[PDB]
């Protein structure tokens, strides 16, 4: 009910091209992402959501609308490639929700993190506070399984959710594989 | 003291050294133009300083200077 | 497969753990790491005798994930061939990788590449052209890709070192260097490849620069103290200084090349003293003479006429000739890359025209204020 603008973060880096987790990790996160938009539909009707791959840099594939159906068609078409790139991720998908096309919605977001990440981790605590000064909540899933712990990630999410937020989560997966969605309960049907 | 817009057109950039190849904005052309309803609009809006002189005094502050 | 692995975990001397990663990656599904390792494992046997087989192996990998850049797949695929020692089997294992590969681009250039890399070293005027020109059309606003790009120019500058067309030779071996920005490279490789790349500069038939070259701030750096000379006649170039290569005889004269092409060298240094001479002369009276010409460049005045016309048809100069008084005009000469002095010169003549034109502008205005005020 509380409107809320979300921002998918699924994640398309070569490390996608292992099945560890199902046929095609980005099949995983392909079918989970799916489940969780559905889910933010149900959640309330005046929500919306978004995705914007973690490709070499950045292309966000879909800003916010409370329609699902262009979300999932440009879901696909996404063959892996390249590297991530973490903070640019973050920035622009900020950049990208304080434009609410309702502002009385609160912002968020959720990301799809498989791969290994290439930062050091005091520039991520200073993204991580700027994005707690804007209020700002992720939802962190250890996807893929690189380090499936802290990648220099922890911090961030405690951070941004920092002195009891309850805002932010690290809901982290091991990379036994079943879709994370069974896995994800608290972030997405409850947080 | 010149025209307020600027136009360029992206095209790719072969170089002799320079060896790869971007792509470099390559100026072109601009000018203002107005059909007759615009025209109209703003010489009505332009009453807040007008000197018409055609003659010489014109084409001696227009240019030269 | 998980047999192979395991029998053949002793190929070679320290193996056991990179056999042991390999069968762990082949249990956990991880692909592109096995990959990342399958390129690190497969430079580490000085020899890799075995991979004649494990491309087998590789063969197998290529076909659940088969992707994971599959232009790694070409990129093992040839380290492979390098060691398979038959034409035949070798071109028809690019040709039947290339198909499988159809579908990735960026990497279909690097099969066509060791496609023409090989018949480079038998036979060439059928395939090696066309392989090449063929290829040219997808190197489409798509830069950044030098991990293909260094490849393809390394083959165009080996082709075209062939025949004699040493001119398209610069400028693949200049756009080589160019896309492989960061040197990264032994020291005896880039010493080469500034030989190379000088003698073709002073072999090449329409290339009148020198001056980029010499000042290649990658290459030159490599040879003041090894082949100085190349240096020297390369200055002596840059100079138009007719004398001063003729000193130098004795030095170029080992070289074949600059051993049989004589005329091509002294009417290049004769053009380029004809520039200097164009360069040099204050703009207001650049009006050589004939005499002159022929005491700067080591002419007779008969023969100096054909000189400057040749100058004028290739594209150096323009300008005229007046054998009535013997003199010719230049209106212009190339433009030429200057220091930084030249460059406090030509800032100077700007701040000359910046004052005259404030000056004269106010001129305007004072005399003319009571009309536009």
Same mark, same amino acid.
């Given at each position: 009910?509380?409107?809320?603008?979300?921002?998918?973060?699924?994640?398309?880096?070569?490390?996608?091209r292992?099945?560890?987790?199902?046929?095609?990790?980005?099949?995983?996160?392909?079918?989970?992402? $799916?489940?969780?938009?559905?889910?933010?539909? /149900?959640?309330?009707?005046?929500?919306?959501?978004?995705?914007?791959?973690?490709?070499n840099?950045?292309?966000?594939?879909?800003?916010?609308?409370?329609?699902?159906?262009?979300?999932?068609?440009?879901?696909?078409?996404?063959?892996?490639?390249?590297?991530?790139?973490?903070?640019?991720?973050? /920035?622009?998908?900020?950049?990208?929700?304080?434009?609410?096309?309702?502002?009385?919605?609160?912002?968020?977001?959720?990301?799809?993190?498989?791969?290994?990440?290439?930062? $050091?981790?005091?520039?991520?605590?200073?993204?991580?506070? /700027?994005?707690?000064?804007?209020?700002?909540?992720?939802?962190?899933?250890?996807?893929?399984?690189?380090?499936?712990?802290?990648?220099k990630?922890?911090?961030?999410?405690?951070?941004?959710?920092?002195?009891? !937020?309850? !805002?932010?989560?690290?809901?982290?997966?091991?990379? !036994?594989?079943?879709?994370?969605?069974?896995?994800?309960?608290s972030?997405?049907?409850?947080? | 003291?010149?025209?307020?817009?600027?136009?360029?057109?992206?095209?790719?950039?072969?170089?002799?050294?320079?060896?790869?190849?971007?792509?470099?904005?390559?100026?072109?052309?601009?000018?203002?133009?107005?059909?007759?309803?615009?025209?109209?609009?703003?010489?009505?809006?332009?009453?807040?300083?007008?000197?018409?002189?055609?003659?010489?005094?014109?084409?001696?502050?227009?240019?030269?200077? | 497969v998980?047999?192979?692995? @395991?029998?053949?975990?002793?190929?070679? %001397?320290?193996?056991? =753990?990179?056999? *042991?990663?390999?069968?762990?990656?082949?249990?956990?599904?991880?692909?592109?790491?096995?990959?990342?390792?399958?390129?690190?494992?497969?430079?580490?046997?000085?020899?890799?005798?075995?991979?004649?087989?494990?491309?087998?192996?590789?063969?197998?990998?290529?076909?659940?994930?088969?992707?994971?850049? %599959?232009?790694?797949?070409?990129?093992?695929?040839?380290?492979?061939?390098?060691?398979?020692?038959?034409?035949?089997?070798?071109?028809?294992?690019?040709?039947?990788?290339?198909?499988?590969?159809?579908?990735?681009?960026?990497?279909?250039?690097?099969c066509? &590449?060791?496609?023409?890399?090989?018949?480079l070293?038998?036979?060439?005027?059928?395939?090696?052209?066309?392989?090449?020109?063929?290829?040219?059309? #997808?190197?489409?606003?798509?830069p950044?890709?030098?991990?293909?790009?260094?490849?393809?120019?390394?083959?165009?500058?080996?082709?075209?070192?062939?025949?004699?067309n *040493?001119?398209?030779?610069?400028?693949?071996?200049?756009?080589?260097?160019?896309?492989?920005?960061?040197?990264d490279? %032994?020291?005896?490789? @880039?010493?080469?490849?500034?030989?190379?790349?000088?003698? =073709?500069?002073?072999?090449?038939?329409? +290339?009148?620069?020198?001056?980029?070259?010499?000042?290649?701030?990658?290459?030159?750096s490599?040879?003041?103290?090894?082949?100085?000379?190349?240096?020297?006649?390369?200055?002596?170039?840059?100079?138009?200084n007719?004398?001063?290569?003729?000193?130098?005889?004795?030095?170029?004269?080992?070289?074949?090349?600059?051993?049989?092409?004589?005329?091509?060298l002294?009417?290049?240094?004769?053009?380029?003293?004809?520039?200097? #001479? &164009?360069?040099?002369?204050?703009?207001? *009276?650049?009006?050589?003479?004939?005499?002159?010409?022929?005491?700067?460049?080591?002419?007779?005045?008969?023969?100096?006429?054909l000189?400057?016309?040749?100058?004028?048809? +290739?594209?150096? +100069?323009?300008?005229?000739?007046?054998?009535?008084?013997?003199?010719?005009?230049?209106?212009?000469?190339?433009?030429?890359?200057?220091?930084?002095? @030249?460059?406090?010169?030509?800032?100077?003549?700007?701040?000359?025209?910046?004052?005259?034109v404030?000056?004269?502008?106010?001129?305007?205005?004072?005399?003319?204020?009571?009309?536009?005020?």
């Open positions: 009910m509380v409107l809320e603008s979300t921002m998918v973060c699924v994640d398309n880096s070569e490390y996608m292992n099945g560890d987790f199902l046929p095609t990790r980005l099949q995983a996160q392909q079918d989970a992402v $799916n489940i969780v938009c559905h889910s933010k539909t /149900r959640s309330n009707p005046e929500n919306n959501v978004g995705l914007i791959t973690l490709a840099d950045c292309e966000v594939l879909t800003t916010l609308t409370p329609d699902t159906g262009r979300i999932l068609s440009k879901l696909h078409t996404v063959q892996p490639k390249g590297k991530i790139t973490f903070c640019t991720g973050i /920035r622009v998908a900020h950049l990208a929700l304080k434009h609410r096309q309702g502002k009385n919605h609160k912002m968020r977001i959720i990301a799809f993190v498989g791969s290994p990440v290439e930062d $050091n981790e005091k520039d991520l605590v200073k993204l991580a506070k /700027r994005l707690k000064k804007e209020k700002v909540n992720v939802d962190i899933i250890n996807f893929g399984e690189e380090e499936v712990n802290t990648e990630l922890t911090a961030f999410v405690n951070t941004l959710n920092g002195k009891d !937020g309850t !805002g932010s989560h690290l809901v982290t997966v091991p990379p !036994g594989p079943s879709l994370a969605d069974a896995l994800i309960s972030p997405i049907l409850a947080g | 003291l010149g025209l307020p817009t600027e136009a360029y057109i992206s095209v790719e950039e072969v170089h002799d050294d320079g060896t790869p190849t971007s792509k470099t904005f390559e100026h072109v052309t601009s000018e203002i133009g107005a059909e007759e309803a615009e025209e109209v609009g703003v010489e009505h809006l332009l009453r807040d300083i007008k000197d018409t002189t055609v003659g010489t005094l014109s084409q001696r502050i227009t240019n030269q200077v | 998980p047999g192979f692995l @395991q029998q053949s975990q002793n190929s070679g %001397p320290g193996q056991p =753990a990179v056999w *042991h990663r390999l069968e762990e990656l082949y249990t956990k599904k991880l692909w592109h790491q096995l990959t990342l390792q399958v390129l690190d494992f497969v430079q580490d046997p000085c020899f890799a005798q075995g991979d004649g087989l494990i491309k087998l192996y590789e063969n197998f990998i290529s076909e659940f994930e088969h992707r994971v850049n %599959p232009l790694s797949l070409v990129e093992i695929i040839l380290h492979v061939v390098r060691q398979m020692t038959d034409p035949n089997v070798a071109l028809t294992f690019l040709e039947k990788t290339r198909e499988k590969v159809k579908s990735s681009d960026e990497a279909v250039i690097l066509k &590449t060791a496609i023409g890399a090989l018949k070293n038998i036979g060439d005027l059928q395939v090696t052209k066309e392989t090449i020109e063929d290829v040219e059309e #997808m190197l489409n606003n798509l950044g890709v030098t991990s293909v790009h260094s490849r393809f120019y390394d083959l165009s500058s080996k082709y075209y070192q062939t025949i004699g *040493h001119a398209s030779y610069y400028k693949d071996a200049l756009r080589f260097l160019g896309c492989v920005d960061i040197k490279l %032994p020291v005896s490789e @880039q010493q080469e490849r500034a030989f190379t790349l000088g003698l =073709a500069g002073l072999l090449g038939e329409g +290339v009148f620069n020198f001056g980029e070259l010499l000042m290649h701030p990658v290459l030159e490599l040879r003041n103290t090894d082949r100085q000379w190349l240096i020297d006649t390369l200055y002596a170039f840059n100079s138009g007719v004398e001063r290569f003729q000193t130098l005889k004795t030095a170029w004269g080992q070289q074949p090349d600059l051993a049989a092409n004589e005329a091509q002294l009417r290049k240094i004769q053009l380029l003293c004809l520039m200097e #001479m &164009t360069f040099t002369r204050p703009a207001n *009276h650049r009006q050589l003479t004939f005499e002159e010409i022929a005491k700067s460049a080591k002419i007779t005045v008969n023969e100096v006429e000189l400057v016309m040749k100058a004028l048809s +290739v594209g150096l +100069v323009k300008g005229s000739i007046d054998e009535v008084d013997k003199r010719v005009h230049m209106t212009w000469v190339q433009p030429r890359v200057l220091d930084l002095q @030249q460059i406090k010169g030509m800032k100077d003549r700007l701040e000359f025209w910046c004052t005259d404030k000056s004269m502008e106010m001129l305007v205005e004072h005399q003319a204020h009571d009309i536009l005020t």
